[PDB]
């Protein structure tokens, strides 16, 4: 009942998450920013970190944060 496990506003950190045939593919990019308000206009592209061969049916998701 734990079918897999692994261990390894001055900035904007971007990520992409997708699944193909059970291969869950993870992409990333980081930069400093000076538009502290909101998303910058100009371009960037993400690059891969890992592909996880996990096989799960996924349709919904949620983020996790620090607490006081």
């Amino acid at each position: 009942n734990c079918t897999f496990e692994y261990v390894s506003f001055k900035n904007l950190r971007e990520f992409v998450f997708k699944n193909i045939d059970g291969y869950f593919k993870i992409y990333s990019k980081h930069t400093p920013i000076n538009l502290v308000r909101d998303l910058p206009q100009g371009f960037s592209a993400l690059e891969p970190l890992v592909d996880l061969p996990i096989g799960i049916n996924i349709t919904r998701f949620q983020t996790l944060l620090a607490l006081h």
């Binding site: 079918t3 045939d21 059970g22 061969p53 996990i54 096989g55 799960i56 049916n57």
Partner: peptide
């Protein structure tokens, strides 16, 4: 199943 959809 789709390919490798691991429904247990």
């Amino acid at each position: 199943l789709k390919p490798f959809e691991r429904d247990i």
